[PDB]
Amino acid sequence: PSVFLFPPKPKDTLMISRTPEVTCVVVDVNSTDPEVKFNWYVDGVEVHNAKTKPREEQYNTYRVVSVLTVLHQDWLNGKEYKCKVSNKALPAPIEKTISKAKGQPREPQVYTLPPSREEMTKNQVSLTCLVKGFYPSDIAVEWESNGQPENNYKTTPPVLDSDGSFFLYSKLTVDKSRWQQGNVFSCSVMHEALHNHYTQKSLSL
Amino acid sequence: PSVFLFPPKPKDTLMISRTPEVTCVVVDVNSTDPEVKFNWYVDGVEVHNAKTKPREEQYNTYRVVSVLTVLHQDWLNGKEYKCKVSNKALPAPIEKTISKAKGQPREPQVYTLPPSREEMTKNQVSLTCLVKGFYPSDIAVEWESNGQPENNYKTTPPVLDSDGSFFLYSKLTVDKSRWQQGNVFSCSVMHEALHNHYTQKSLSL
């Protein structure tokens, strides 16, 4: 018996449109009694609105999931979520808790950065978005142009900087021509320390 | 009994000045007979120049190390290194092998990138070095100025790009003044696909 507790995605907690969930995975439950109940605890008080997914025999044992929709404000305010798993004839229930990382939240700085001169000898070129000074590391970055989402972009993991804040870069790739004929590209950042959790910074020739 | 086999550091294999080593860690050896011999195999042929570190009782069992100096060309040419561990009364020796990642090596592109205009409102500023298009991901990046190594720099892990090559950024932090009063900063890259495994690209106001 091993129990794994997963947090919601940042984007899910930052946009009120989306639905943030905490999922409780239990695996390696002996096929003897694969009957298991879930007790969910939000900051002490128990809650009872957790969908519990139908058990599924893994090829090797059973694995089952309990899903709990969370309130955007609760998670961001730092309430602990507690997953108590109960199994008939199991010495004691297992308890796993989760909460958003603790620490002074801190607003990210977003600078857009055009390609180098030496890079203009290719047919693709690199538009850079630097995002730094933020805390916690949970963040979301996307490129777009003319309100259309962009594609050839990859974003580094957050890296821990020397002041305890985090930074990342995001690299967008567009053909020299798209950038050459003017054209405005745009780096989007989602983070709990921004106003309305969101910022645009743009970049053109 | 568990055996862990570790590769040399990139910088060790790329500079002939340095000494690249492959280390064989074996842990969880029952304290009954903590006597264990090592057999080293380079691309089939056995070698016999591996220093073997004196066994050490872990607080919990024994852990012992065998260190093998490697030839820069051997590792880069892709020879497999094989660690055969022998223990008296152990059902069969354990075999672990290691070699440099396979795949067409590919030369990194290095572009230096000055700060954004909007970043000039601070007293620190960010000088960026983008390194992309390289394969394998083993690489080494450092900043300097006037042949003096620099400091406030952090470098992202390599990220897998859409063409199968890798890229990273490296961010150096200097006070606005150092950058303002001219001054030339310099990003260094070490990689097996560069000539003499090394490149400088510079950056000034």
Ligand SMILES: *[C@@H]1O[C@H](CO)[C@@H](O[C@@H]2O[C@H](CO)[C@@H](O[C@@H]3O[C@H](CO[C@H]4O[C@H](CO)[C@@H](O)[C@H](O)[C@@H]4O[C@@H]4O[C@H](CO)[C@@H](O[C@@H]5O[C@H](CO)[C@H](O)[C@H](O)[C@H]5O)[C@H](O)[C@H]4NC(C)=O)[C@@H](O)[C@H](O[C@H]4O[C@H](CO)[C@@H](O)[C@H](O)[C@@H]4O[C@@H]4O[C@H](CO)[C@@H](O)[C@H](O)[C@H]4NC(C)=O)[C@@H]3O)[C@H](O)[C@H]2NC(C)=O)[C@H](O)[C@H]1NC(C)=O
């Ligand atoms: C029989 O066969 C079984 C399968 O059929 C097999 O079950 C596996 O057991 C493994 C061993 O226990 C277990 O391994 C763990 O996996 C953890 C990661 O799991 C995610 O990523 C995998 C890919 O890498 C996926 O395959 C998983 O399904 C899982 O995927 C995540 O799933 C969640 C839930 O659905 C999902 O969240 C929700 O997503 C939706 C969208 O769909 C929304 O976004 C919701 O908002 C969101 O809530 C995730 O998005 C999804 N992510 C991904 C990437 O897919 C892995 O992290 C575990 O590592 C832990 O343990 C080791 C050992 O200590 C630590 O080194 C490690 O750091 C982790 O634990 C640390 O513990 C520390 C304390 O000691 C603590 O301080 C640390 O904080 C903590 N770590 C961290 C990072 O904080 C572990 O590897 C595997 O998941 C099981 N597979 C399945 C399918 O269940 C079983 O074992 C077999 N049995 C036998 C006997 O053979």
Ligand SMILES: *[C@@H]1O[C@H](CO)[C@@H](O[C@@H]2O[C@H](CO)[C@@H](O[C@@H]3O[C@H](CO[C@H]4O[C@H](CO)[C@@H](O)[C@H](O)[C@@H]4O[C@@H]4O[C@H](CO)[C@@H](O[C@@H]5O[C@H](CO)[C@H](O)[C@H](O)[C@H]5O)[C@H](O)[C@H]4NC(C)=O)[C@@H](O)[C@H](O[C@H]4O[C@H](CO)[C@@H](O)[C@H](O)[C@@H]4O[C@@H]4O[C@H](CO)[C@@H](O)[C@H](O)[C@H]4NC(C)=O)[C@@H]3O)[C@H](O)[C@H]2NC(C)=O)[C@H](O)[C@H]1NC(C)=O
């Ligand atoms: C009793 O107490 C014992 C300790 O006293 C304890 O021993 C520990 O056991 C652990 C469990 O087995 C074991 O955990 C492994 O650790 C691996 C990483 O170890 C490095 O990093 C640790 C910090 O994160 C350090 O503490 C380690 O010492 C080790 O540090 C590295 O050391 C080497 C050798 O010295 C060094 O190389 C040399 O350095 C010099 C400079 O000094 C030069 O540069 C040389 O050129 C160079 O050669 C490294 O630089 C140094 N690095 C660092 C960062 O410190 C960890 O990677 C292991 O993970 C593997 O297993 C899991 C499980 O499957 C996988 O998820 C994981 O990906 C790894 O295995 C994968 O296997 C796949 C196949 O299934 C394969 O496809 C993958 O390729 C492969 N993974 C990868 C990434 O490719 C694992 O966590 C720990 O090291 C032991 N500690 C010690 C001190 O030995 C023992 O367990 C206890 N016993 C009991 C019963 O309680």
Ligand SMILES: *[C@@H]1O[C@H](CO)[C@@H](O[C@@H]2O[C@H](CO)[C@@H](O)[C@H](O)[C@H]2NC(C)=O)[C@H](O)[C@H]1NC(C)=O
């Ligand atoms: C799963 O549970 C069953 C039942 O608890 C285990 O089978 C028992 O194993 C013990 C240990 O020798 C025996 O004394 C019992 O007589 C067994 N009973 C039955 C009904 O099989 C089984 O080994 C467990 N398997 C795992 C992987 O945990």
Ligand SMILES: *[C@@H]1O[C@H](CO)[C@@H](O[C@@H]2O[C@H](CO)[C@@H](O)[C@H](O)[C@H]2NC(C)=O)[C@H](O)[C@H]1NC(C)=O
């Ligand atoms: C380490 O090895 C010793 C000896 O092989 C183990 O002790 C033996 O355990 C078996 C299993 O019950 C007994 O039948 C033997 O009589 C024991 N002999 C001695 C000398 O103790 C010991 O359990 C092993 N420990 C670990 C963690 O592997």
